[PDB]
Amino acid sequence: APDSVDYRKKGYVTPVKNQGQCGSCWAFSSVGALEGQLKKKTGKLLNLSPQNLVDCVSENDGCGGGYMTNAFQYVQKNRGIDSEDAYPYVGQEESCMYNPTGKAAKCRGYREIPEGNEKALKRAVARVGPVSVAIDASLTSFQFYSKGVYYDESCNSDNLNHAVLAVGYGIQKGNKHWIIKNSWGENWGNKGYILMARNKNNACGIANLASFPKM
Ligand SMILES: *C(#N)N1[C][C][C]([N]C(=O)[C]([C][C]([C])[C])[N]C(=O)O[C]C2=[C][C]=[C][C]=[C]2)[C]1
């Protein structure tokens, strides 16, 4: 496992999206993980449809919340997920309108990273690619994050409330971190991204609910 990995330098990541007010972070976190695998496998980078998950994965609660796991299982059993292009994001739950012609990627199920193991999350990010993770993003400091490695000791690893994508990891001036792609738009944090503390005893529980799609 390399000291630092950034899948943005390998074209595994599409642009930062904006989930709006809809609590569909789990949808963007899943799509992001899929996009990474789609590029790694087929060689092409495509924008997948989070709206498709929000509307079709009835195992989740749409704009209310959901799990990346059900998201992945759905894509699998449904035999595909549409492209963002064929299934535009609207920001609110609507009736499932999946269209097989607009099918952009498939999935053979998912894998889960050992609960709370950042070292295992690290190796997974290097071996597989961008991974879907759940964090505690309920803090004022998290919302007004601008630069540097994020570390708020009020974060609670037992308080997971947001799903994001780990496109890599590394170190900035000795401070180990996780390169995290958010879905609050380009104006949030550092152009939609935030460097979250790595190896600081599972800060914000970034490894308590980590998973990635098999493809
Ligand atoms: C995003 N956006 N946010 C909005 C709500 C918050 N909650 C969830 O999505 C969590 C999982 C995260 C911690 C990653 N899970 C959830 O609330 O699912 C509700 C559910 C799903 C399926 C059956 C019963 C309940 C993430």
Coordinates of N, CA and C and ligand atoms in Angstrom, one line a residue:
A1 N 0.9 -1.2 0.0 CA 0.0 0.0 0.0 C 0.9 1.2 0.0
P2 N 0.8 2.1 -1.0 CA 1.5 3.3 -1.2 C 1.3 4.3 0.0
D3 N 2.3 5.1 0.3 CA 2.2 6.1 1.4 C 1.0 7.1 1.1
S4 N 0.8 7.4 -0.2 CA -0.3 8.3 -0.6 C -0.8 7.9 -1.9
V5 N -2.2 7.9 -2.0 CA -2.9 7.6 -3.2 C -4.0 8.6 -3.5
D6 N -4.1 9.1 -4.7 CA -5.1 10.1 -5.1 C -5.6 9.7 -6.4
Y7 N -6.8 9.1 -6.4 CA -7.5 8.6 -7.6 C -7.9 9.7 -8.5
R8 N -7.8 11.0 -8.1 CA -8.2 12.1 -8.9 C -7.1 12.3 -10.0
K9 N -5.9 11.8 -9.7 CA -4.8 11.9 -10.6 C -4.8 10.7 -11.6
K10 N -5.8 9.8 -11.5 CA -5.9 8.7 -12.4 C -7.3 8.7 -13.1
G11 N -8.0 9.8 -13.0 CA -9.3 9.9 -13.7 C -10.3 9.0 -13.2
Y12 N -10.3 8.7 -11.9 CA -11.3 7.8 -11.3 C -12.5 8.6 -10.8
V13 N -12.3 9.9 -10.7 CA -13.3 10.8 -10.1 C -14.0 11.8 -11.0
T14 N -15.3 11.9 -11.0 CA -16.0 12.9 -11.8 C -16.1 14.1 -10.9
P15 N -16.7 15.2 -11.5 CA -16.8 16.5 -10.7 C -17.7 16.4 -9.5
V16 N -17.5 17.4 -8.6 CA -18.2 17.5 -7.4 C -19.7 17.8 -7.7
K17 N -20.6 17.1 -7.0 CA -22.0 17.3 -7.3 C -22.6 18.0 -6.1
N18 N -23.9 18.3 -6.2 CA -24.6 19.0 -5.1 C -26.0 18.3 -4.8
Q19 N -26.1 17.6 -3.7 CA -27.3 16.9 -3.3 C -28.5 17.7 -2.9
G20 N -28.3 19.0 -2.9 CA -29.3 19.9 -2.5 C -29.8 19.7 -1.1
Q21 N -31.0 19.8 -0.8 CA -31.6 19.6 0.6 C -31.9 18.2 0.9
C22 N -32.1 17.4 -0.2 CA -32.4 16.0 -0.2 C -31.3 15.2 0.6
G23 N -31.7 14.4 1.6 CA -30.7 13.7 2.3 C -30.2 12.4 1.6
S24 N -29.7 12.6 0.4 CA -29.3 11.5 -0.5 C -27.8 11.3 -0.5
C25 N -27.0 11.8 0.5 CA -25.6 11.6 0.5 C -25.2 10.2 0.2
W26 N -26.0 9.2 0.8 CA -25.7 7.8 0.5 C -25.8 7.5 -0.9
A27 N -26.6 8.2 -1.7 CA -26.7 7.9 -3.1 C -25.5 8.5 -3.8
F28 N -25.0 9.6 -3.5 CA -23.8 10.2 -4.1 C -22.6 9.4 -3.7
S29 N -22.5 8.9 -2.5 CA -21.4 8.2 -2.0 C -21.3 6.9 -2.8
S30 N -22.5 6.2 -3.0 CA -22.5 5.0 -3.8 C -22.1 5.2 -5.2
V31 N -22.7 6.2 -5.9 CA -22.4 6.5 -7.3 C -21.0 6.8 -7.4
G32 N -20.4 7.6 -6.5 CA -19.0 7.9 -6.6 C -18.1 6.7 -6.6
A33 N -18.5 5.7 -5.7 CA -17.7 4.5 -5.6 C -17.9 3.7 -6.9
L34 N -19.0 3.7 -7.5 CA -19.3 3.0 -8.7 C -18.5 3.6 -9.9
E35 N -18.5 4.9 -10.0 CA -17.8 5.6 -11.1 C -16.3 5.2 -11.0
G36 N -15.8 5.1 -9.8 CA -14.4 4.7 -9.7 C -14.1 3.4 -10.2
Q37 N -15.0 2.4 -9.9 CA -14.9 1.1 -10.4 C -15.1 1.0 -11.9
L38 N -16.1 1.8 -12.4 CA -16.4 1.8 -13.8 C -15.2 2.2 -14.7
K39 N -14.5 3.2 -14.2 CA -13.3 3.7 -14.9 C -12.2 2.7 -14.8
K40 N -12.0 2.1 -13.7 CA -10.9 1.2 -13.5 C -11.1 -0.1 -14.3
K41 N -12.4 -0.5 -14.5 CA -12.7 -1.7 -15.2 C -12.8 -1.4 -16.7
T42 N -13.7 -0.5 -17.1 CA -13.9 -0.2 -18.6 C -12.9 0.8 -19.2
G43 N -12.3 1.6 -18.3 CA -11.4 2.6 -18.8 C -12.1 3.9 -19.1
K44 N -13.4 4.0 -18.9 CA -14.0 5.3 -19.2 C -14.7 5.8 -17.9
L45 N -14.7 7.1 -17.8 CA -15.2 7.8 -16.6 C -16.6 8.4 -17.0
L46 N -17.6 7.9 -16.3 CA -19.0 8.4 -16.6 C -19.7 8.8 -15.3
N47 N -20.6 9.8 -15.5 CA -21.4 10.3 -14.4 C -22.6 9.4 -14.2
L48 N -22.6 8.7 -13.0 CA -23.8 7.8 -12.7 C -24.9 8.5 -12.1
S49 N -26.1 8.0 -12.1 CA -27.3 8.6 -11.6 C -27.7 8.3 -10.1
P50 N -27.5 9.3 -9.2 CA -27.8 9.1 -7.8 C -29.4 9.1 -7.6
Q51 N -30.0 9.9 -8.5 CA -31.5 10.0 -8.5 C -32.1 8.6 -8.7
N52 N -31.5 7.8 -9.5 CA -31.9 6.4 -9.8 C -31.9 5.7 -8.4
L53 N -30.9 5.9 -7.6 CA -30.9 5.2 -6.3 C -31.9 5.7 -5.4
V54 N -32.0 7.0 -5.3 CA -33.0 7.7 -4.4 C -34.4 7.2 -4.7
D55 N -34.7 7.1 -6.0 CA -36.0 6.8 -6.5 C -36.3 5.3 -6.5
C56 N -35.3 4.4 -6.8 CA -35.5 3.0 -6.9 C -35.1 2.1 -5.8
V57 N -34.1 2.4 -5.0 CA -33.7 1.6 -3.8 C -34.7 1.8 -2.7
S58 N -35.8 1.0 -2.8 CA -36.9 1.1 -1.8 C -36.4 0.5 -0.4
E59 N -35.2 -0.1 -0.4 CA -34.6 -0.6 0.8 C -34.1 0.5 1.7
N60 N -34.0 1.7 1.1 CA -33.6 2.9 1.8 C -34.8 3.8 1.9
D61 N -34.5 5.0 2.5 CA -35.6 6.0 2.8 C -35.5 7.3 1.9
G62 N -35.1 7.1 0.6 CA -34.9 8.2 -0.3 C -34.2 9.4 0.3
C63 N -34.9 10.6 0.3 CA -34.3 11.8 0.8 C -34.2 11.8 2.3
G64 N -34.7 10.7 2.9 CA -34.6 10.6 4.3 C -33.3 10.0 4.8
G65 N -32.8 9.1 4.0 CA -31.5 8.5 4.3 C -31.5 7.1 3.7
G66 N -30.4 6.4 3.9 CA -30.3 5.0 3.3 C -28.9 4.5 3.5
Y67 N -28.6 3.3 3.1 CA -27.3 2.7 3.2 C -26.7 2.4 1.9
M68 N -25.3 2.6 1.8 CA -24.6 2.4 0.6 C -24.8 0.9 0.2
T69 N -24.9 0.1 1.2 CA -25.0 -1.4 1.0 C -26.2 -1.7 0.2
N70 N -27.4 -1.2 0.6 CA -28.6 -1.5 -0.1 C -28.5 -0.9 -1.5
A71 N -27.9 0.3 -1.6 CA -27.6 0.9 -2.9 C -26.9 0.0 -3.8
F72 N -25.8 -0.6 -3.4 CA -25.0 -1.5 -4.2 C -25.8 -2.8 -4.5
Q73 N -26.5 -3.3 -3.6 CA -27.2 -4.5 -3.8 C -28.3 -4.3 -4.9
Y74 N -28.9 -3.1 -4.9 CA -29.9 -2.7 -5.8 C -29.3 -2.7 -7.2
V75 N -28.2 -2.0 -7.4 CA -27.6 -1.9 -8.7 C -27.4 -3.3 -9.3
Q76 N -26.9 -4.2 -8.4 CA -26.6 -5.6 -8.7 C -27.9 -6.3 -9.2
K77 N -28.8 -6.4 -8.3 CA -30.1 -7.1 -8.6 C -30.9 -6.5 -9.7
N78 N -30.8 -5.2 -9.9 CA -31.5 -4.4 -10.9 C -30.7 -4.6 -12.3
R79 N -29.5 -5.1 -12.2 CA -28.6 -5.4 -13.3 C -28.1 -4.1 -13.9
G80 N -27.9 -3.1 -13.1 CA -27.4 -1.8 -13.6 C -27.9 -0.6 -13.0
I81 N -27.2 0.5 -13.3 CA -27.6 1.8 -12.8 C -27.5 2.7 -14.0
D82 N -28.5 3.7 -14.1 CA -28.5 4.6 -15.3 C -27.4 5.7 -15.1
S83 N -27.1 6.4 -16.2 CA -26.1 7.4 -16.2 C -26.9 8.7 -15.6
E84 N -26.1 9.6 -15.1 CA -26.7 10.8 -14.6 C -27.5 11.5 -15.7
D85 N -27.0 11.3 -16.9 CA -27.5 11.8 -18.1 C -28.9 11.2 -18.4
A86 N -29.0 9.9 -18.3 CA -30.3 9.2 -18.6 C -31.2 9.3 -17.4
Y87 N -30.8 9.6 -16.3 CA -31.6 9.7 -15.1 C -31.2 10.9 -14.2
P88 N -31.5 12.1 -14.7 CA -31.2 13.4 -14.0 C -31.5 13.5 -12.6
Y89 N -30.7 14.2 -11.8 CA -30.9 14.4 -10.4 C -31.8 15.5 -10.2
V90 N -32.9 15.4 -9.4 CA -33.8 16.4 -9.1 C -33.9 16.9 -7.7
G91 N -33.3 16.1 -6.8 CA -33.2 16.5 -5.4 C -34.4 16.2 -4.5
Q92 N -35.3 15.3 -5.0 CA -36.5 14.9 -4.2 C -36.9 13.6 -4.7
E93 N -37.4 12.7 -3.8 CA -37.8 11.4 -4.2 C -39.0 11.4 -5.1
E94 N -38.9 10.6 -6.2 CA -39.9 10.4 -7.2 C -40.1 9.0 -7.5
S95 N -41.1 8.7 -8.3 CA -41.4 7.3 -8.7 C -40.2 6.7 -9.5
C96 N -39.8 5.5 -9.2 CA -38.7 4.8 -10.0 C -38.9 4.9 -11.5
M97 N -37.9 5.5 -12.2 CA -38.0 5.6 -13.6 C -36.7 5.0 -14.3
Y98 N -36.2 3.9 -13.7 CA -35.1 3.2 -14.3 C -35.3 2.8 -15.7
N99 N -34.4 3.1 -16.6 CA -34.5 2.7 -18.0 C -33.2 2.0 -18.4
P100 N -33.4 0.7 -18.7 CA -32.2 -0.2 -19.1 C -31.4 0.4 -20.2
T101 N -32.0 1.1 -21.2 CA -31.2 1.6 -22.3 C -30.1 2.6 -21.7
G102 N -30.5 3.3 -20.7 CA -29.5 4.3 -20.1 C -28.6 3.7 -19.1
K103 N -28.5 2.3 -19.1 CA -27.6 1.6 -18.2 C -26.1 1.9 -18.5
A104 N -25.5 2.5 -17.5 CA -24.1 2.9 -17.6 C -23.1 2.0 -16.8
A105 N -23.5 1.3 -15.8 CA -22.6 0.5 -15.0 C -23.3 -0.7 -14.3
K106 N -22.6 -1.7 -14.0 CA -23.1 -2.9 -13.3 C -22.4 -3.1 -12.0
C107 N -22.9 -4.1 -11.2 CA -22.3 -4.4 -9.9 C -22.5 -5.8 -9.5
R108 N -21.5 -6.5 -9.0 CA -21.6 -7.9 -8.5 C -21.8 -8.0 -7.0
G109 N -22.2 -6.9 -6.4 CA -22.4 -6.9 -4.9 C -21.4 -5.9 -4.3
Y110 N -21.2 -6.0 -3.0 CA -20.2 -5.1 -2.3 C -19.4 -5.8 -1.3
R111 N -18.4 -5.1 -0.8 CA -17.6 -5.6 0.3 C -17.6 -4.5 1.4
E112 N -17.4 -5.0 2.7 CA -17.4 -4.1 3.8 C -16.0 -4.1 4.5
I113 N -15.5 -2.9 4.8 CA -14.2 -2.8 5.4 C -14.4 -3.1 6.9
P114 N -13.4 -3.9 7.5 CA -13.5 -4.2 8.9 C -13.9 -3.0 9.8
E115 N -15.0 -3.1 10.5 CA -15.4 -2.0 11.3 C -14.4 -1.3 12.2
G116 N -14.2 0.0 11.9 CA -13.2 0.8 12.7 C -11.7 0.6 12.3
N117 N -11.4 -0.2 11.3 CA -10.0 -0.4 10.9 C -9.5 0.6 9.8
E118 N -8.9 1.7 10.2 CA -8.4 2.6 9.3 C -7.3 2.0 8.4
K119 N -6.5 1.1 9.0 CA -5.4 0.5 8.2 C -6.0 -0.4 7.1
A120 N -7.1 -1.0 7.4 CA -7.8 -1.9 6.4 C -8.5 -1.0 5.4
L121 N -8.9 0.2 5.8 CA -9.6 1.1 4.9 C -8.5 1.6 3.9
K122 N -7.3 1.9 4.4 CA -6.2 2.4 3.6 C -5.8 1.4 2.5
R123 N -5.6 0.1 2.9 CA -5.3 -0.9 2.0 C -6.4 -1.1 0.9
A124 N -7.6 -1.0 1.4 CA -8.8 -1.1 0.5 C -8.8 0.0 -0.6
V125 N -8.5 1.2 -0.1 CA -8.5 2.4 -1.0 C -7.4 2.2 -2.1
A126 N -6.3 1.6 -1.7 CA -5.2 1.4 -2.6 C -5.4 0.2 -3.5
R127 N -6.0 -0.9 -3.0 CA -6.3 -2.1 -3.8 C -7.5 -1.9 -4.8
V128 N -8.6 -1.3 -4.3 CA -9.8 -1.2 -5.1 C -9.9 0.2 -5.8
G129 N -9.9 1.2 -5.0 CA -10.0 2.6 -5.6 C -10.9 3.4 -4.6
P130 N -11.5 4.5 -5.0 CA -12.4 5.2 -4.1 C -13.4 4.4 -3.4
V131 N -13.5 4.6 -2.1 CA -14.4 3.9 -1.2 C -15.5 4.7 -0.6
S132 N -16.7 4.2 -0.4 CA -17.8 4.9 0.2 C -17.7 4.8 1.7
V133 N -17.8 5.9 2.4 CA -17.7 5.9 3.9 C -18.7 6.8 4.5
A134 N -18.9 6.5 5.8 CA -19.9 7.3 6.6 C -19.1 8.0 7.7
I135 N -19.4 9.3 7.9 CA -18.7 10.1 8.9 C -19.6 11.0 9.7
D136 N -19.1 11.6 10.7 CA -19.8 12.5 11.6 C -19.6 13.9 11.0
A137 N -20.5 14.4 10.2 CA -20.3 15.7 9.6 C -21.4 16.7 10.2
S138 N -21.7 16.6 11.5 CA -22.7 17.4 12.1 C -22.1 18.7 12.8
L139 N -20.8 18.8 12.8 CA -20.2 20.0 13.4 C -20.0 21.3 12.6
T140 N -20.1 22.4 13.3 CA -19.9 23.7 12.8 C -18.6 23.8 12.0
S141 N -17.5 23.2 12.6 CA -16.2 23.2 12.0 C -16.2 22.5 10.7
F142 N -17.0 21.4 10.6 CA -17.1 20.6 9.4 C -17.7 21.4 8.3
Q143 N -18.8 22.2 8.6 CA -19.5 23.0 7.6 C -18.7 24.1 7.1
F144 N -17.9 24.8 7.9 CA -17.1 25.9 7.5 C -15.7 25.6 7.2
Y145 N -15.4 24.3 7.0 CA -14.1 23.8 6.7 C -13.6 24.6 5.4
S146 N -12.4 25.0 5.4 CA -11.8 25.7 4.3 C -10.6 25.0 3.8
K147 N -9.6 24.8 4.6 CA -8.3 24.1 4.2 C -7.6 23.3 5.3
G148 N -6.5 22.7 5.0 CA -5.8 21.9 6.0 C -6.5 20.6 6.4
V149 N -5.8 19.8 7.3 CA -6.4 18.6 7.7 C -7.4 18.8 8.8
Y150 N -8.7 18.4 8.5 CA -9.8 18.5 9.4 C -9.7 17.6 10.6
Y151 N -9.8 18.3 11.8 CA -9.7 17.5 13.1 C -10.4 18.3 14.2
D152 N -11.6 17.9 14.5 CA -12.4 18.5 15.6 C -12.6 17.4 16.6
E153 N -12.1 17.6 17.9 CA -12.2 16.6 18.9 C -13.6 16.4 19.5
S154 N -14.6 17.1 18.9 CA -16.0 16.9 19.3 C -16.7 16.0 18.4
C155 N -16.0 15.5 17.3 CA -16.5 14.6 16.4 C -16.7 13.3 17.2
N156 N -17.7 12.5 16.8 CA -18.0 11.3 17.5 C -18.1 10.2 16.5
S157 N -17.3 9.2 16.6 CA -17.2 8.1 15.7 C -18.5 7.2 15.8
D158 N -19.3 7.4 16.8 CA -20.5 6.7 17.0 C -21.7 7.5 16.4
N159 N -21.4 8.7 16.0 CA -22.4 9.6 15.4 C -22.3 9.8 13.9
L160 N -22.4 8.7 13.1 CA -22.4 8.7 11.7 C -23.6 9.4 11.1
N161 N -23.5 10.4 10.3 CA -24.7 11.1 9.8 C -24.6 11.6 8.3
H162 N -23.5 11.2 7.7 CA -23.2 11.7 6.3 C -22.4 10.6 5.5
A163 N -22.7 10.5 4.3 CA -22.0 9.5 3.4 C -21.2 10.3 2.4
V164 N -19.9 10.0 2.3 CA -19.1 10.6 1.3 C -18.1 9.6 0.7
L165 N -17.3 10.1 -0.2 CA -16.3 9.3 -0.9 C -14.9 9.6 -0.7
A166 N -14.1 8.5 -0.3 CA -12.7 8.6 -0.1 C -12.0 8.3 -1.4
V167 N -11.5 9.3 -2.1 CA -10.9 9.1 -3.4 C -9.4 8.8 -3.3
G168 N -8.9 8.9 -2.1 CA -7.5 8.7 -1.8 C -7.1 9.1 -0.4
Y169 N -5.8 9.2 -0.1 CA -5.3 9.6 1.2 C -3.9 10.0 1.0
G170 N -3.3 10.6 2.1 CA -1.9 11.0 2.0 C -1.5 11.8 3.3
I171 N -0.6 12.7 3.1 CA -0.1 13.5 4.3 C 0.2 14.9 3.9
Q172 N -0.1 15.9 4.7 CA 0.1 17.3 4.5 C 0.9 17.8 5.7
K173 N 2.2 18.1 5.5 CA 3.0 18.6 6.6 C 3.0 17.7 7.8
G174 N 3.1 16.4 7.6 CA 3.1 15.4 8.7 C 1.7 15.0 9.2
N175 N 0.7 15.7 8.8 CA -0.7 15.4 9.2 C -1.3 14.4 8.2
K176 N -1.4 13.2 8.6 CA -2.0 12.1 7.8 C -3.5 12.4 7.5
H177 N -4.0 12.1 6.3 CA -5.4 12.4 6.0 C -6.0 11.5 5.0
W178 N -7.3 11.7 4.8 CA -8.1 10.9 3.8 C -8.6 12.0 2.9
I179 N -8.4 11.8 1.6 CA -8.9 12.7 0.6 C -10.4 12.4 0.4
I180 N -11.3 13.3 0.9 CA -12.7 13.1 0.8 C -13.5 14.0 -0.1
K181 N -14.2 13.4 -1.0 CA -15.1 14.1 -2.0 C -16.5 14.2 -1.3
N182 N -16.9 15.5 -1.2 CA -18.3 15.7 -0.6 C -19.3 15.9 -1.7
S183 N -20.5 16.1 -1.3 CA -21.6 16.3 -2.3 C -22.4 17.5 -2.0
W184 N -21.8 18.5 -1.4 CA -22.5 19.7 -1.0 C -22.2 20.9 -2.0
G185 N -21.7 20.5 -3.2 CA -21.4 21.5 -4.2 C -19.9 22.0 -4.2
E186 N -19.5 22.6 -5.2 CA -18.1 23.1 -5.4 C -17.8 24.2 -4.4
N187 N -18.8 24.9 -3.9 CA -18.6 26.0 -3.0 C -18.3 25.6 -1.5
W188 N -18.6 24.4 -1.2 CA -18.3 23.9 0.1 C -16.8 23.5 0.3
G189 N -16.3 23.7 1.5 CA -14.9 23.3 1.8 C -13.9 23.8 0.7
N190 N -12.9 22.9 0.4 CA -11.9 23.2 -0.5 C -12.3 22.7 -1.9
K191 N -13.2 23.4 -2.6 CA -13.7 23.1 -3.9 C -14.5 21.8 -3.9
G192 N -15.2 21.5 -2.7 CA -16.0 20.3 -2.6 C -15.3 19.2 -1.9
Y193 N -14.0 19.4 -1.6 CA -13.3 18.4 -0.9 C -12.8 18.8 0.5
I194 N -12.4 17.8 1.3 CA -11.9 18.1 2.6 C -10.9 17.0 2.9
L195 N -9.8 17.3 3.6 CA -8.8 16.4 4.0 C -9.2 16.0 5.5
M196 N -9.6 14.8 5.7 CA -10.0 14.4 7.0 C -8.9 13.6 7.7
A197 N -8.7 14.0 9.0 CA -7.6 13.3 9.8 C -7.6 11.8 9.6
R198 N -6.4 11.3 9.3 CA -6.2 9.8 9.2 C -5.3 9.3 10.3
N199 N -5.7 8.1 10.9 CA -5.0 7.5 12.0 C -5.0 8.3 13.3
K200 N -6.1 9.1 13.4 CA -6.3 9.9 14.7 C -7.4 9.2 15.4
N201 N -7.2 7.9 15.6 CA -8.2 7.0 16.3 C -9.6 7.1 15.7
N202 N -9.7 6.8 14.4 CA -10.9 6.7 13.7 C -11.8 8.0 13.9
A203 N -11.1 9.2 13.6 CA -11.8 10.4 13.7 C -13.1 10.5 12.9
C204 N -14.2 10.9 13.6 CA -15.5 11.0 12.9 C -16.0 9.6 12.4
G205 N -15.4 8.6 12.9 CA -15.8 7.2 12.5 C -15.7 6.9 11.0
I206 N -14.8 7.6 10.3 CA -14.6 7.5 8.9 C -14.4 6.0 8.4
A207 N -14.2 5.1 9.4 CA -14.0 3.7 9.0 C -15.0 2.7 9.6
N208 N -16.1 3.3 10.3 CA -17.1 2.5 11.0 C -18.1 1.8 10.0
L209 N -18.3 2.5 8.9 CA -19.2 2.0 7.9 C -18.7 2.2 6.5
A210 N -17.6 1.6 6.2 CA -16.9 1.7 4.9 C -17.2 0.5 4.0
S211 N -17.4 0.8 2.7 CA -17.8 -0.2 1.8 C -17.5 0.2 0.3
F212 N -17.4 -0.8 -0.6 CA -17.2 -0.5 -2.0 C -17.8 -1.6 -2.8
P213 N -18.3 -1.2 -4.0 CA -18.9 -2.1 -5.0 C -18.0 -3.1 -5.7
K214 N -18.4 -4.3 -5.9 CA -17.6 -5.3 -6.6 C -18.1 -5.0 -8.0
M215 N -17.1 -5.1 -9.0 CA -17.5 -4.8 -10.4 C -16.6 -5.7 -11.2
Ligands
LIG1 C1 -27.2 12.0 3.8 N1 -27.6 13.1 3.1 N2 -27.5 11.9 5.2 C2 -28.9 12.2 5.4 C3 -29.4 11.3 6.5 C4 -28.2 10.5 6.9 N3 -28.6 9.1 7.3 C5 -28.3 8.0 6.6 O1 -28.4 8.0 5.4 C6 -27.8 6.7 7.4 C7 -26.5 6.2 6.7 C8 -25.5 7.3 6.8 C9 -24.9 7.3 8.2 C10 -24.4 6.9 5.8 N4 -28.8 5.6 7.3 C11 -30.2 5.8 7.3 O2 -30.7 6.8 7.9 O3 -31.0 5.0 6.6 C12 -32.3 5.0 7.1 C13 -32.9 3.6 6.9 C14 -32.5 2.9 5.7 C15 -33.1 1.6 5.5 C16 -34.0 1.1 6.4 C17 -34.4 1.8 7.5 C18 -33.8 3.1 7.8 C19 -27.2 10.6 5.7

